[PDB]
């Protein structure tokens, strides 16, 4: 019944029918009831992959981005939270087009929407890792999100910091690019290794273990990472330098 309702609504939006009416009814589903968020994300995914009409997803992200929440509305934040999490999990390429409007919610006082959009940036960078459409189609929209995840290590409530560290730790698994950012993630993790909450500290230990198991210094010597041997490797630059000076820079960043 769920896929039948999804296909009826998708046929209504795509070929013939008001996208505004279905859009406002989806927003009322996100407003009043907290269980229909996964249904909304799956309907927009069915629009994004089969009927290739992605304007409704951008319109939903627009109208979510400009929304004011009542002080006693403990439901709408959670519905938009699970909706943005599931839409980052399901359709990240269509969600990347309006993320500069989506991340406006990072100054809303609700903790749940901040953790939602931080996990959305983490999942939206972590899925755009398969190579031949990522590093040239969207290059600065992914870099501003990497920098945004770096800045969210300093939020007031520690759950947003925990979601930032978890998004950074799921970024560091798949590495076909952005190997410059791993050193900054290491620096942010060893800075945040002594915070106030135990949760952000524990997740920073997990992030350091994740980036230590997959350090990019492979295919030379067996990757055992001693400061003595790599310092003698850098001391060999007198025998090397004074075309392969990138190996000297390699040894310096590994020493750091």
């Amino acid at each position: 019944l769920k896929m039948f309702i999804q296909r009826i609504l998708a046929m209504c939006v795509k070929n013939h029918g008001q996208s505004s009416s279905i859009q406002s009814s989806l927003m009322t589903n996100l407003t009043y009831f907290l269980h229909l968020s996964v249904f909304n994300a799956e309907l927009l995914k069915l629009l994004n992959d089969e009927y290739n009409y992605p304007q409704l997803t951008e319109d939903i992200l627009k109208e979510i981005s400009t929304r004011v929440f009542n002080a006693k509305d403990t439901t709408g934040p959670k519905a938009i939270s699970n909706f943005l999490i599931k839409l980052s999990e399901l359709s990240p390429g269509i969600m990347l087009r309006q993320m500069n409007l989506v991340i406006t919610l990072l100054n809303n006082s609700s903790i749940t929407l901040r953790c939602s959009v931080v996990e959305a940036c983490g999942n939206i960078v972590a899925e755009l890792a398969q190579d031949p459409q990522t590093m040239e189609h969207y290059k600065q929209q992914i870099a501003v999100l990497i920098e945004l995840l770096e800045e969210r290590f300093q939020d007031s409530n520690p759950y947003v910091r925990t979601k930032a560290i978890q998004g950074c730790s799921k970024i560091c698994d798949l590495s076909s690019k952005f190997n410059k950012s791993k050193a900054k993630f290491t620096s942010l993790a060893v800075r945040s290794l002594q915070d106030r909450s135990s949760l952000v500290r524990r997740n920073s230990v997990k992030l350091l273990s994740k980036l230590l198991l997959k350090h990019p210094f492979k295919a030379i010597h067996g990757s055992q990472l001693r400061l003595s041997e790599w310092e003698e490797y850098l001391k060999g630059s007198e025998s090397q330098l004074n075309k392969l000076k990138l190996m000297i820079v390699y040894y310096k960043d590994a020493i750091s």
């Binding site: 407003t31 400009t66 009542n70 403990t74 300093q154």
Partner: protein
């Protein structure tokens, strides 16, 4: 049947005492309409058994508080959906966190 009456009484009371009358399991309960007529509280003689009267009053107050919590959340949702007609930094420095 009165067997269903006492059975619904006992399952509502045991749902009340382990604290699971939330904002959603409230409106499908009728413990108030078993509290009003005192036929379940009167045990043995005409005297009121105050043990189950106290347990029933605690469950009734749980149902009432969860119902006013439910109307609070419903007015919040309606106020949000009607206040959407109208169509600066949370980051702190690292001294506050260390």
């Amino acid at each position: 049947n009165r067997s269903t009456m006492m059975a619904n009484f006992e399952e509502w009371i045991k749902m009340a005492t382990d604290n699971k009358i939330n904002s959603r399991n409230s409106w499908n309960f009728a413990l108030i309409d078993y509290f009003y007529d005192l036929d379940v509280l009167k045990d043995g003689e005409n005297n009121i058994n105050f043990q189950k009267a106290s347990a029933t009053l605690d469950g009734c107050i749980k149902i009432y508080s969860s119902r006013v919590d439910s109307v609070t959340t419903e007015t919040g949702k309606l106020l949000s959906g009607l206040a959407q007609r109208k169509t600066e930094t949370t980051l702190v420095e690292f001294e506050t966190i260390k």
